[PDB]
Design a protein around this ligand. Structure first.
Ligand code: ATP
Ligand code: ATP
Ligand code: ATP
Ligand code: ATP
Lengths: 268, 336, 292, 348, 361, 278
C-alpha cells in the first residue's frame, strides 16, 4: 500500500524520451479523469505494457511515476514474492495479491525483473520451470476475466525480452514495447535543470562542460558526477569549485564507467 | 448395528496396505496419507488370502485387519495395455496369411511344442521383427496369433507412470522385465515412437532399442531359471535404421518377416474384416475395390470406411446408392 | 502483524511482540570488529582514500552535505586479481569507525527451497532502514549478477533475482539510502549494466598488480604482525616481482620461514626473499631443457 | 515362548513403523516418522542398536513413540529385478576354438578363492577384476568364463547400455545394486558390457549433454577408483570399442589383464559350430567341411543364423526335408548380405 | 535370547522414564527476541510458537537459531538439542578408521615431505608454528599424472594423529538439493572448532569446475554453483581453516579456480611420478611380495617401463605371480616376468599409449 | 447417505454466454469446409439412431495444437452461438493444491458431471504443464497430478460408450505431452491449427479494424502493403497494438503515421546482401 512516486512534473522532467512521456500520460492517468473519450470513439486502452532496457535509463521510472499519478491507487509487486517456498502456495497469493489489487480502482499492476520468474520453456529443465508457468497461469487467469480488464493496466519489465516465450512475446498479455534513447544538444541544458536540485555550485558557471563529457549515462550516474565533483569540494575546503577541477573529476570517473558499459546489446 | 457402531464409534475404522507379510503373524499396515504401521494378530480371514501390496481393512482400537479386500495391481498395467490395442483376434486380421505361417512356428513352439526343440535342433527364438511403410496389421496380428495360442498379451511403453510406481533410480526396462514375469506368460510388442522427425532411432531408442534388451533378459531367465517359457516380442518399424536392429542382433536368433506395404492380398480380406462390426449389404465387390488403390497405406483401409462413412451419415440413411461408392473412392484418390 | 503471543485454544492475544523473523535470516552474521586496521596496506594509500571516503563521509560529514546538497555514495565496486587484499581492507575500515559489520556472501543466498535469498533482502534492507550504518559487505557480485544471454536459468537464480531486488529497493524506495552497502568482485568479465546508479555501484577503481614500491611495502606490512628479518635492502625483492600476487608475497615469508625449520636458524637473509619470490612464480617446479 | 506373550503388552498390540534420524549418547534415539515429527526414544529393549544405522525402517510403538525392535526391509522395487542365480546354462560345451586366449585369463578369474596360500603371502594382490572389450562377441567370448564362474561363488550381470540409466547421475542406486548382491554371499563377480558412449545418437532427456555424460563417467571412475573399497566386488568391464577410459582410469584397473580376441579362423569356426551344435544339430548329417569352405569369410555369428533358418524353412514340411533349388536360394539372402560389403579395401 | 532377555526386561524402568521428555516433539527453531522471558519459536509442524523457557534452563543459553525441546501441553522450552542438521548426506561425508600407512610411498621424498608439514606437523606441534609464525598456509592442491592419486590422501588416514577426518567428493553434492554444500562446509568447521583436528577434503574438482561462461543455454552456469560457491566458502577467514583443508583433482582445469587459489591457497605441486632411480622404491615394497629371487635386478626393468608410476609396475610383480601359477612354478626370476613386462607395456600401448599431454592439450 | 448425485464441486462453469463473439458465416461460402464441420459438431452433440445403424462409434477426442496464431477460444465462444451447453473452463494448474487427497476428487467431480449432464463440454487450457515427468518427492505431488491426468484419462473411457462428454484440448507446445495422451481410442482426432502464414494476414487486419474507429477516412490500402512487409509474425495482437497506438492519439480519427509506426518497431529486418536473388 505504501508505494509512492511523484509527478506529473517529475515524470515529465526526466528529459526523455519526449514522446514516451506523452505515451503513458494518456494511456494510464487519462482513463480515470476522462473515461468518456475512449468509449465514445470506440478505441480501447491497452491492457498491458512492457518496458525493457538498459539502452540508457528509465525502464522502471517511466511506468513508475505514472503509477501513482493515476491516483493514490497503486499496488507494487516484487519478484521475490512469486518464488514462495517448497510446494509454494503463492499460486493463491498471486490470486490474493491481485484480489486486493482490485480493491484499488482503477487498478495498476507492476512486474519487475521478470527475467528471473519468467522462466523459458525452450530447453525443458527441472519442474521449477513448470511452477514458473503455473504462477504465470495465476497471472493470466484473473487478468483474463470475466472481471475488470480494460480498466486495469498491467506492466512488466525485463532485462532482455527473450525470456517472455511466444506467449508473453505476443501482445495481449504484454502489449507495448518501448526502449530508451539518448538526449540531444540544447536539450542537455533541459535535463540539466532538473538534475540541479539540491546540489548547488558557484554563481558564474556553464554546466555544458559537465554533462557533455559524460554521454550515454544513467540519470543517477550524471547525478553521481555532480556529487563526485561536489565531494571533491570538501578536499578543497571550499563550498564551490572552479570548473577546471570539475572537468577533471567529471572526465576521469566518466571514462571509467564506459569501460564497464559492455553488454549493452539487447535482443529485439 | 448400534452395538457394532459403538465398536466403530471412537476413531471409526481405517483401511491399510500391507507391504510385506511375516510368519510371526505381525502384519505391516500402511495408510496412504499416513505412515506405515504394524500390529500383532489380528487373524480373521484365512492367511493364504493375505498377500503383500493387497488392500486390507483396519480397525481403530487394536489397529488390526478386520477383513481381506481385493486389490488392483495387474488391472493398473493391463488397463494401459488395452488402451494401445483392441483385441484383434485371427478373425480381426487378414492378408498376412503368408506371414502368419512364418510367425506361428516361432510363437506356437514354446507354448505347446517345446519338447520337440531337441528334435528340431534350434534354441528358443529371441524375437521377431516387422519392418515396412505403414500400413497396419502389425499391431493387430500381435494379439491375433496369441489369441488362438491361448497365451495372454501385454502391450508396450510409453510408461509413463512406471517412473514412480517403479523408481527413477530403478533400472526401468529391467523393472518392466519383472512385470512381464509377474504377469502370466505373455507376448510383447513395439509401439511406437517411430517418427519422421528427420530420420533416426534417436527418439525411438527410448521405447525400442532399450526394450531390445528386455527381450534378451527375459529369455535369459526363462532359459536359466524362474518359469515358465512363453515370453515373446514383436517389432514395428518402417525403413532405414532397421538395418541397425540387424546390427544389434547378428541374426541370432530372429524370425524373418518383412512387414509389407498394403498389398492386393492384404486389402481384400482386411476390408471385410472391419466390415463385420457394421451391418451392410453384400452388393459390394471387395475384390476389385481393393485393386483400384495400389498404394497409400494400410490405415487407409479404415480411412475408406470410417472417414467416408460420414457421408452416409449425412443423408440420414443406413445405406447409400452406388453413386456414393464411387465418391468414397474419389475422396481417397485426392490425398494420393 | 505477526509474532504475537496467544494461549492454547483460548485464542486471546495478551501482547504484540516484535521483532520480525527468522533465525539466520534476521541476522546473517554477527561480527564485532576485525583484528586488523586500514594501516595494513602498503602502497595503496592512493586508492584507499576513495574507499575510506564513501563509508566515512555520510557519518561525520553529513552536516556539511545538507548545506552543499551533497549525496553520499552507496554502492562501491572493489575488484582486482587475487590476492588483492580487498576483504581485509574492507572490514578493517569498520574497526576504527565503530561501524557494526555483517558478513554476507552472494552464493550463500541460494538454497534448495526457492524464495529464500530473495526474501532475505526484504528482511535485510528492512534492517537497513531500522539500523544506522554500521555497514554491509558482500563478495562475488559478478558471478551472482550473471543473466547469461538465453535464459532461464543459471545456477545463481535466487541471487540474480535477489541482487536486482537489492538493486530494486535502492531504486523505488528513497529511505534505502541508509546503511551503505559495499560490494566486491574478483573479475569484471560479467557485469550487469543495471548496476550503474547512485544507490547502486558508484565508486569503481580497477586494481592492477601493485607496483615495485607497493609490492615491497605490502610484504612488510603483512609481516608487521610477525617477526621481520633484518639486513634487507627491500629494493632487490621489489624489482624482481612482476605480476606476482600480494597473497603470494605472504607465502614468500611462509616458505622462507618453513625452510628456517630445517635450516636450524630463525634468522633470514635478503636473498631468501627473492628465493621464495621466484619460487611460487613463475609456476613450478620444472626447468628449461630441450629448448636450446 | 513366554517372551512372545510378555513384551506384546509392553509394545503393542498396535504400533507404527517410523524411520531413524540420529542417536545421542544419553540413550535417547531421535527418530522421524511421517510426517515431520521427532522425539527422544530411550529404550534398552532388543537392541541391536549398533546394527541398525539410520535410514532404517525401525518400528515406533503407539504408546508412546518408542522403538521395540525391527522386522526387515525388502526393499524398494529395485531389488526384485535379477533374482539370482544365474546358474551355468551357458556351457563350456557351447564355446570352442580359442586356445591362446582361454589359457591366460582362466587364471585371473580363478586367482582369488582357490590357492589362497601364495595369494596372501603376496599381500599386494590384484583384486581389481578384469576388463573385456571388442565386437561383436569378443566381450562375450570370455563371458563364458563368467558363467563358468557361476558354478561357485557368485556372479552379477549389469547392462550398461546408453540412455535409460540416467539418475543424477551421482550413481547413487547402482552402487546399491552392487552392494546388495554382495551382502548375500560376499565373494562377487560384477560384469559390465556394451558401453555405447562413443556411439550415442543423442543425449537422454535433460542430461548434459556432452561433458555431463563425461562427468558421470568420471564419477564411474571415482566409484571404481576407489575410496575406499578393499574386498570384491570383482570389476569386469566390456564394450564394443573403448576410447572411453582416460589414461588415469586404466591405472587402478585393469592395469593387469585386458583382453582382445581376433576374428576366428577355419580352426576356430569349425570348433565354434561343431561345439555349438554338440547339443542340437539339424537333421544330423551336418558336415563342417563345406560350410566354412562355401562362405569366405565372416564370423561364426551368422553360421548359426543360416542354420536357424535351415530347419526353420524345412519346418514348412513340419520336420525334415531339403529342397536343392530353395535351400541355395534361401542361402543367397545371407550370402549376398555378406557379399554386398565384401571389399574394404582390400582390408590389409 | 539370553542377551535379549534382560535387554527386553528393562522396559519397567523405561516406561517410568518414558513419561518425562515424551513431549519433546517436535524439534523447533527460534526466530528473534524482544525481551528476556519470551522468544518466538518455529516448529516443523509449520506452526510458530512464542513461549518462555522453563526454570530448569537459563535464558542466556538460548541463541537465535537453536533447536530446543518442548512440552506439547505448555509449549515451553524443555532441553536444547545441538544438531540442527542434516538429512542424509553425512554417511558418504563421514570417513573413519585407518588404512594405507606411510610405508606405501613409492620413493617420492620432497613431494610427500612438504605436504606432510602442511598438515601433520602443525597439528602434532601446535606451539611450534605458532611461535615460529609467520602463519600456516590456507590450503594445498594435488594434480598431475595419475600415479599416485587418491593414495596420498589415504596416507594421512593411517598417519592420523588423533581423530578421523572428513572426505568429500564432488559428485555426491550434485543437485537435487542445492545449498547443502554451503550449509555443509559451514557446519563441519563449527563441528571442528569444538574438537578441532578434523580435515576437510574434496576430490575431482575438474568436472564441477567448468569455466567460465558460454552464450547459451547454460550449461556451465549451473556448474558455477559447485566451483564458485566452494571456492567462496574456502575464501572465508575462519580460520581458515584450522586444518588448512586439502585439494586433489586430475587436470589443472579450469582457469578460474586455478587463478583463485593463489590468492588464498598455496603449495601447488606437480607429480612426480617416478624418478629413473625411484622406480625401484615401488619394487622395494613389492620385494616383500610372495618370494623374490636374489638374482632379480630392479634397476634393469625400471628403465624399460617409462611413466609407469606405481600402478603399471604393480602389474609387473602381478604378472610375475600371474604367469607363475599359469606355469605352475613358484617364484619368478627377473627374466621371467620382464619378458612379459616388455609385452605389457607395448601391447597395452597399441590402443592407447597412455599420454597425459593430450588431456590438457 | 451419499450425494444425489451431485452437489458438484467448487469454482464454476458457463460464463461464455455474454455474446457476441464471431459469426460462422465467414466459411459459409465454401460449404466444403462446413460440411465436414457440420458432421463433426452438431451431429456428435445429440444424435442417437444414426450411429448404431452405421456402427461407427464417434470419438470424443479434440486436440488443438499449432499456436501461434491464437485461434482456439474464438471457435469456443463461436460454438456457444452454434449450440448451448455447459462449458467447464479450468486452467491446467487450477486443481493444484497443498494436499494430494483432494486432487483425485476434483477431476472426478469434473468428469462425473459430464456423464451426468448432457450436453456437456469441458475445456482445459494447456495441460502440457503437468505432463512433465519428475519422480522426485517434492515433485511427487507434481507427478501425482500427472497420474491424476492419467486418472481422469482412466475416467474418460468411462464415458465409453457413448454417453456422454465432449473433450476439447488446447496446448501451446505438445512436445512435453506423453504418447498415450495423443494415442487414438481416447483422443482420436488431432486438429492442428495452421500457422498464420499468408492466409491469416488479411483476415486478421480486417477483424481488428472493425473494432477500431472508422477508418472511413483512413484508407487500408497502404497499411496492407508496407506494414505487411515487416510483420514478424507477430500476427494477431500486434494489429491490436496498431489500435493501441490510436489511444496514443491525440487525434480523433487515427492518422496514417500511427499505424505505420506500430508495425515498424516489431519485428526488425536486416537486409539485403543475400536474398537479393529475388
Ligand atoms: N480474429 C482474431 N484472430 C486471432 N486471435 C484473436 C482474434 N480476436 C481475438 N483474438 C485473441 O484471442 C485471445 C483469446 O485466446 P485464449 O483465451 O484461448 O488465449 P490464447 O490466445 O490461446 O493464449 P496463447 O496465445 O498464449 O496460447 C484474445 O486475447 C484475443 O486477443
Ligand atoms: N594489494 C594488497 N594490499 C594488502 N594486502 C594484500 C594485497 N594483496 C594481497 N594481500 C594479502 O593477501 C592475503 C589474501 O587476501 P585476498 O586478497 O586473497 O582476499 P580476497 O581475494 O580479497 O578475498 P575475496 O576473494 O573474498 O574478495 C590477505 O591476507 C592480504 O593481506
Ligand atoms: N532522467 C532522470 N532524472 C532524474 N533522475 C533520474 C533520471 N534517470 C534516472 N534517474 C535516477 O536513477 C535512479 C534509477 O532510475 P531508473 O529506474 O530509470 O534506472 P534503472 O531502471 O535502475 O536502471 P536499469 O534500467 O539499468 O535497471 C532513480 O532513483 C532516479 O532518481
Ligand atoms: N609411486 C607410487 N607409490 C605407490 N603407489 C603408487 C605410485 N604410483 C602409483 N601408485 C598407485 O597407483 C594407483 C592408481 O592411481 P589412480 O589412477 O587411482 O590415481 P588417480 O586418483 O586417478 O589420480 P588423479 O586423481 O590425478 O586422476 C594408486 O592406487 C596408487 O596407490
Amino acid at each position: 500500500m505504501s508505494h509512492e512516486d511523484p509527478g506529473n512534473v517529475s515524470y515529465s522532467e526526466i528529459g526523455g524520451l519526449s514522446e514516451q512521456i506523452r505515451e503513458l500520460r494518456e494511456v494510464i492517468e487519462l482513463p480515470l479523469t476522462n473515461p468518456e473519450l475512449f468509449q465514445r470513439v470506440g478505441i480501447i486502452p491497452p491492457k498491458g505494457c512492457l518496458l525493457y532496457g538498459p539502452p540508457g535509463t528509465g525502464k522502471t521510472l517511466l511506468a513508475r511515476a505514472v503509477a501513482s499519478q493515476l491516483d493514490c491507487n497503486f499496488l507494487k509487486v516484487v519478484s521475490s514474492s512469486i518464488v514462495d517456498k517448497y510446494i509454494g502456495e503463492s499460486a493463491r497469493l498471486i490470486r490474493e495479491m491481485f484480489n486486493y489489487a482490485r480493491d484499488h480502482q482503477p487498478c495498476i499492476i507492476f512486474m519487475d525483473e521478470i527475467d528471473a520468474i519468467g522462466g523459458r520453456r525452450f530447453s525443458e529443465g527441472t519442474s521449477a520451470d513448470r511452477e514458473i508457468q503455473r504462477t504465470l497461469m495465476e497471472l493470466l487467469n484473473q487478468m483474463d476475466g470475466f472481471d475488470t480488464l480494460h480498466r486495469v493496466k498491467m506492466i512488466m519489465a525485463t532485462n532482455r525480452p527473450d525470456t517472455l516465450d511466444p506467449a508473453l512475446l505476443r501482445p495481449g498479455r504484454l502489449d507495448r514495447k518501448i526502449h530508451i534513447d539518448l538526449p540531444n544538444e540544447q536539450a542537455r541544458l533541459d535535463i540539466l535543470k532538473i538534475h540541479a536540485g539540491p546540489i548547488t555550485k558557484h554563481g558564474e558557471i556553464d554546466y555544458e562542460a559537465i554533462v557533455k563529457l559524460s554521454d550515454g549515462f544513467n540519470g543517477a550516474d550524471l547525478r553521481n558526477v555532480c556529487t563526485e565533483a561536489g565531494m571533491f569540494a570538501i578536499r578543497a575546503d571550499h563550498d564551490f569549485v572552479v570548473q577546471e577541477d570539475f572537468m577533471k573529476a567529471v572526465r576521469k570517473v566518466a571514462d571509467s564507467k564506459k569501460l564497464e558499459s559492455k553488454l549493452d546489446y539487447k535482443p529485439v | 448395528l448400534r452395538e457394532e457402531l459403538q465398536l466403530l464409534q471412537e476413531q471409526g475404522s481405517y483401511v491399510g496396505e500391507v507391504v510385506r507379510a511375516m510368519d510371526k503373524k505381525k502384519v505391516l499396515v500402511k495408510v496412504h496419507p499416513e505412515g506405515k504401521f504394524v500390529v500383532d494378530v489380528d487373524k480373521n480371514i484365512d492367511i493364504n488370502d493375505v498377500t503383500p501390496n493387497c488392500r486390507v481393512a483396519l480397525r481403530n482400537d487394536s489397529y488390526t485387519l478386520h477383513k481381506i479386500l481385493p486389490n488392483k495391481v495387474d488391472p493398473l498395467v493391463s488397463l494401459m495395455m488395452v488402451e494401445k490395442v483392441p483385441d484383434s483376434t485371427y478373425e480381426m486380421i487378414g492378408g498376412l496369411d503368408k506371414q502368419i505361417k512364418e510367425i506361428k512356428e516361432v510363437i506356437e513352439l514354446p507354448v505347446k511344442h517345446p519338447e520337440l526343440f531337441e528334435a528340431l535342433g534350434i534354441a528358443q527364438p529371441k524375437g521377431v521383427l516387422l519392418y515396412g511403410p505403414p500400413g497396419t496389421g502389425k499391431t493387430l496380428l500381435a494379439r491375433a496369433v496369441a489369441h488362438h495360442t491361448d497365451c495372454t498379451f501385454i502391450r508396450v511403453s510409453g510408461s509413463e507412470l512406471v517412473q514412480k510406481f517403479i523408481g527413477e533410480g530403478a533400472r526401468m526396462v529391467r523393472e518392466l522385465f519383472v512385470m512381464a514375469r509377474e504377469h502370466a506368460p505373455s507376448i510383447i510388442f513395439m509401439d511406437e515412437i517411430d517418427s519422421i522427425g528427420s530420420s533416426r532411432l534417436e527418439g525411438g531408442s527410448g521405447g525400442d532399442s532399450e526394450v531390445q534388451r528386455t527381450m534378451l533378459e527375459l529369455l535369459n531367465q526363462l532359459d536359466g531359471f524362474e518359469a515358465t517359457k512363453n515370453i515373446k516380442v514383436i517389432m514395428a518399424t518402417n525403413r532405414i535404421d532397421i538395418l541397425d536392429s540387424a546390427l544389434l542382433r547378428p541374426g541370432r536368433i530372429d524370425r524373418k518377416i518383412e512387414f509389407p506395404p498394403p498389398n492386393e492380398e492384404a486389402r481384400l480380406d482386411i476390408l471385410k474384416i472391419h466390415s463385420r462390426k457394421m451391418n451392410l449389404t453384400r452388393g459390394i465387390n471387395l475384390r476389385k475395390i481393393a485393386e483400384l488403390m495400389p498404394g497409400a497405406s494400410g490405415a487407409e483401409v479404415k480411412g475408406v470406411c470410417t472417414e467416408a462413412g460420414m457421408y452416409a451419415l449425412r443423408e440420414r440413411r443406413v445405406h447409400v446408392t452406388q453413386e456414393d461408392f464411387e465418391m468414397a473412392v474419389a475422396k481417397v484418390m485426392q490425398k494420393d | 502483524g505477526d509474532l504475537v503471543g496467544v494461549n492454547k485454544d483460548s485464542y486471546l492475544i495478551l501482547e504484540t511482540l516484535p521483532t520480525e523473523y527468522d533465525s539466520r535470516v534476521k541476522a546473517m552474521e554477527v561480527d564485532e570488529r576485525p583484528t586488523e586496521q586500514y594501516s595494513d596496506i602498503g602502497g595503496l594509500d592512493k586508492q584507499i582514500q576513495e574507499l575510506v571516503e564513501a563509508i566515512v563521509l555520510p557519518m561525520n560529514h553529513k552536516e556539511k552535505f545538507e548545506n552543499l546538497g551533497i549525496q553520499p555514495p552507496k554502492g562501491v565496486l572493489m575488484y582486482g586479481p587475487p590476492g588483492t587484499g580487498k576483504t581485509l581492507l574492507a572490514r578493517a575500515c569498520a574497526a576504527q569507525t565503530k561501524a557494526t559489520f555483517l558478513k554476507l556472501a552472494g552464493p550463500q543466498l541460494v538454497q534448495m527451497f526457492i524464495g529464500d535469498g530473495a526474501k532475505l533482502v526484504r528482511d535485510a534492507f528492512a534492517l537497513a532502514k531500522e539500523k544506522a550504518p554500521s555497514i554491509i559487505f558482500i563478495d562475488e557480485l559478478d558471478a551472482i549478477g550473471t543473466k547469461r544471454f538465453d535464459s532461464e536459468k543459471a545456477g545463481d537464480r535466487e541471487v540474480q533475482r535477489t541482487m536486482l531486488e537489492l538493486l530494486n529497493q535502492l531504486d523505488g524506495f528513497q529511505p534505502n539510502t541508509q546503511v551503505k552497502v559495499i560490494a566486491a568482485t574478483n573479475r569484471v568479465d560479467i557485469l550487469d549494466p543495471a548496476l550503474l546508479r547512485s544507490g547502486r555501484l558508484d565508486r569503481k577503481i580497477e586494481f592492477p598488480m601493485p607496483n615495485e614500491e607497493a609490492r615491497a611495502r605490502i610484504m612488510q606490512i603483512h609481516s608487521r604482525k610477525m617477526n621481520v628479518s633484518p639486513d634487507v635492502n627491500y629494493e632487490e625483492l621489489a624489482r624482481c616481482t612482476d605480476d606476482f600476487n600480494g597473497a603470494q608475497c605472504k607465502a614468500v615469508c611462509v616458505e622462507a620461514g618453513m625452510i628456517a625449520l630445517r635450516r636450524g636458524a630463525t634468522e633470514l637473509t635478503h636473498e631468501d626473499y627473492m628465493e621464495g619470490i621466484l619460487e611460487v612464480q613463475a609456476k613450478k617446479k620444472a626447468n628449461l631443457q630441450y629448448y636450446a | 515362548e513366554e517372551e512372545r506373550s510378555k513384551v506384546d503388552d509392553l509394545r503393542g498390540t498396535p504400533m507404527s513403523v517410523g524411520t531413524l534420524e540420529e542417536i545421542i549418547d544419553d540413550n535417547h534415539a531421535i527418530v522421524s516418522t511421517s510426517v515431520g515429527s521427532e522425539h527422544y526414544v530411550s529404550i534398552l529393549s532388543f537392541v541391536d542398536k549398533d546394527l541398525l544405522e539410520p535410514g532404517c525402517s525401525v518400528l515406533l510403538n503407539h504408546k508412546v513413540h518408542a522403538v521395540i525392535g525391527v522386522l526387515m526391509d525388502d526393499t524398494d522395487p529395485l531389488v526384485t529385478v535379477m533374482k539370482v542365480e544365474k546358474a551355468p546354462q551357458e556351457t563350456y560345451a557351447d564355446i570352442g576354438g580359442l586356445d591362446n586366449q582361454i589359457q591366460e585369463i582362466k587364471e585371473s578369474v580363478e586367482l582369488p578363492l582357490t590357492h589362497p596360500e601364495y595369494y596372501e603371502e603376496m599381500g599386494i594382490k590384484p583384486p581389481k577384476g578384469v576388463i573385456l572389450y571388442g565386437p561383436p562377441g569378443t566381450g562375450k567370448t570370455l563371458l563364458a568364463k563368467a558363467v563358468a564362474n557361476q558354478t561357485s561363488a557368485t556372479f552379477l550381470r549389469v547392462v550398461g547400455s546408453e540412455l535409460i540409466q540416467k539418475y543424477l547421475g551421482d550413481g547413487p542406486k547402482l552402487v546399491r545394486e552392487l552392494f546388495r548382491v554382495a551382502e548375500e554371499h560376499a565373494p562377487s563377480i560384477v560384469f559390465i558390457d556394451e558401453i555405447d558412449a562413443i556411439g550415442t545418437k543423442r543425449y537422454d532427456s535433460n542430461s548434459g549433454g556432452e561433458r555431463e555424460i563425461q562427468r558421470t563417467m568420471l564419477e564411474l571412475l571415482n566409484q571404481l577408483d576407489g575410496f575406499d573399497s578393499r574386498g570384491d566386488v570383482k570389476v569386469i568391464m566390456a564394450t564394443n570399442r573403448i576410447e572411453t577410459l582416460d589414461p588415469a582410469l586404466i591405472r587402478p584397473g585393469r592395469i593387469d589383464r585386458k583382453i582382445e580376441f581376433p576374428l576366428p579362423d577355419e580352426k576356430t569356426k569349425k570348433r565354434i559350430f561343431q561345439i555349438h551344435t554338440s547339443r542340437m544339430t539339424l537333421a544330423d548329417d551336418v558336415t563342417l567341411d563345406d560350410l566354412i569352405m562355401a562362405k569366405d569369410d565372416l564370423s561364426g555369428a551368422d553360421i548359426k543364423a543360416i542354420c536357424t533358418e535351415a530347419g526353420l524353412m524345412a519346418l514348412r514340411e513340419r520336420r525334415m526335408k531339403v529342397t536343392n533349388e530353395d535351400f541355395k536360394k534361401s542361402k543367397e539372402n545371407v550370402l549376398y548380405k555378406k557379399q554386398e560389403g565384401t571389399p574394404e579395401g582390400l582390408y590389409l | 535370547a539370553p542377551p535379549a532377555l534382560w535387554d527386553l526386561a528393562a522396559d519397567k524402568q523405561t516406561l517410568q522414564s518414558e513419561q518425562p521428555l515424551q513431549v519433546a516433539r517436535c524439534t523447533k527453531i527460534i526466530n528473534a527476541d524482544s525481551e528476556d522471558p519470551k522468544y518466538i519459536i518455529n516448529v516443523k509442524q509449520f506452526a510458530k510458537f512464542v513461549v518462555d523457557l522453563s526454570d530448569q534452563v537459563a535464558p542466556t543459553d538460548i541463541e537465535e537459531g537453536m533447536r530446543v525441546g518442548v512440552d506439547r501441553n505448555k509449549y515451553q522450552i524443555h532441553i536444547p538439542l545441538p544438531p540442527k542438521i542434516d538429512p542424509t548426506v553425512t554417511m558418504m561425508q563421514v570417513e573413519e578408521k585407518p588404512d594405507v600407512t606411510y610405508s606405501d610411498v613409492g620413493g617420492c621424498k620432497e613431494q610427500i615431505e612438504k605436504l606432510r608439514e602442511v598438515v601433520e606437523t602443525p597439528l602434532l606441534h601446535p606451539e611450534r608454528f605458532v611461535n615460529l609464525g609467520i602463519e600456516p598456509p590456507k590450503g594445498v592442491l594435488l594434480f598431475g599424472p595419475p600415479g599416485t592419486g587418491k593414495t596420498l590422501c589415504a596416507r594421512a588416514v593411517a598417519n592420523r594423529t588423533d581423530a578421523c577426518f572428513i572426505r568429500v567428493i564432488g559428485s555426491e553434492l550434485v543437485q537435487k538439493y542445492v545449498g547443502e554444500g554451503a550449509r555443509m562446509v559451514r557446519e563441519l568447521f563449527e563441528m571442528a572448532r569444538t574438537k578441532k583436528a578434523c580435515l576437510i577434503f574434496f576430490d575431482e574438482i575438474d568436472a564441477i569446475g567448468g569455466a567460465r561462461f558460454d552464450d547459451g543455454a547454460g550449461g556451465d552456469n549451473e556448474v558455477q554453483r559447485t566451483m564458485l560457491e566452494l571456492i567462496n566458502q574456502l575464501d572465508g577467514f575462519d580460520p581458515r581453516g584450522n586444518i588448512k583443508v586439502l585439494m586433489a583433482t586430475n587436470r589443472p582445469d579450469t582457469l578460474d579456480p586455478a587463478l583463485m587459489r593463489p590468492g588464498r591457497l598455496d603449495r601447488k605441486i606437480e607429480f612426480s611420478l617416478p624418478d629413473l632411480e625411484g622406480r625401484t622404491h615401488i619394487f622395494k615394497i613389492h620385494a616383500r611380495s610372495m618370494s623374490v629371487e636374489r638374482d632379480i635386478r630392479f634397476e634393469l626393468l625400471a628403465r624399460l617401463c617409462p611413466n609407469s608410476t606405481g600402478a603399471e609396475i604393480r602389474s609387473v610383480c602381478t604378472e610375475a605371480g600371474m604367469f607363475a601359477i599359469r606355469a605352475r612354478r613358484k617364484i619368478a626370476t627377473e627374466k621371467d616376468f620382464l619378458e612379459a613386462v616388455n609385452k605389457v607395456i607395448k601391447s597395452y600401448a597399441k590402443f592407447s599409449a597412455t599420454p597425459r599431454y593430450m588431456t590438457y592439450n | 447417505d451419499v450425494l444425489p448425485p451431485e452437489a458438484d464441486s467448487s469454482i464454476m462453469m458457463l460464463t461464455s454466454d455474454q455474446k457476441p463473439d464471431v459469426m460462422y458465416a465467414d466459411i459459409g461460402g465454401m460449404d466444403i469446409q462446413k460440411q465436414e464441420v457440420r458432421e463433426a459438431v452438431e451431429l456428435p452433440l445429440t444424435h442417437f439412431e444414426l450411429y448404431k445403424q452405421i456402427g461407427i462409434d464417434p470419438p470424443r477426442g479434440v486436440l488443438m495444437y499449432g499456436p501461434p496464431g491464437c485461434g482456439k477460444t474464438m471457435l469456443a465462444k463461436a460454438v456457444a452461438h452454434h449450440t448451448t451447453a455447459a462449458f467447464i473452463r479450468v486452467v491446467g494448474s487450477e486443481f493444484v493444491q497443498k494436499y494430494l487427497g483432494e486432487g483425485p476428487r476434483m477431476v472426478r467431480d469434473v468428469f462425473r458431471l459430464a456423464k451426468e449432464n448432457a450436453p456437456a463440454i469441458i475445456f482445459i487450457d494447456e495441460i502440457d504443464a503437468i505432463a512433465t515427468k519428475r519422480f522426485d518427492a517434492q515433485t511427487g505431488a507434481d507427478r501425482e497430478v500427472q497420474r491424476i491426468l492419467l486418472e481422469l484419462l482412466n475416467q474418460m473411457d468411462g464415458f465409453d460408450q457413448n454417453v456422454n462428454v465432449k473433450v476439447i484440448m488446447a496446448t501451446n507446445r505438445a512436445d512435453t505431452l506423453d504418447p498415450a495422451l495423443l494415442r487414438p481410442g481416447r483422443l482420436d482426432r488431432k486438429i492442428e491449427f495452421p500457422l498464420p502464414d499468408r492466409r491469416q494476414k488479411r483476415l486478421i487486419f480486417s477483424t481488428i479494424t472493425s473494432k477500431m474507429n472508422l477508418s472511413e477516412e483512413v484508407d487500408l490500402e497502404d497499411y496492407v502493403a508496407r506494414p505487411d512487409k515487416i510483420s514478424g509474425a507477430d500476427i494477431n495482437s500486434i494489429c491490436q497494438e496498431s489500435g493501441m497506438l490510436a489511444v496514443r492519439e491525440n487525434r480523433y480519427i487515427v492518422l496514417a503515421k500511427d499505424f505505420e509506426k506500430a508495425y515498424k518497431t516489431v519485428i526488425k529486418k536486416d537486409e539485403q546482401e543475400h536474398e537479393f536473388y529475388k
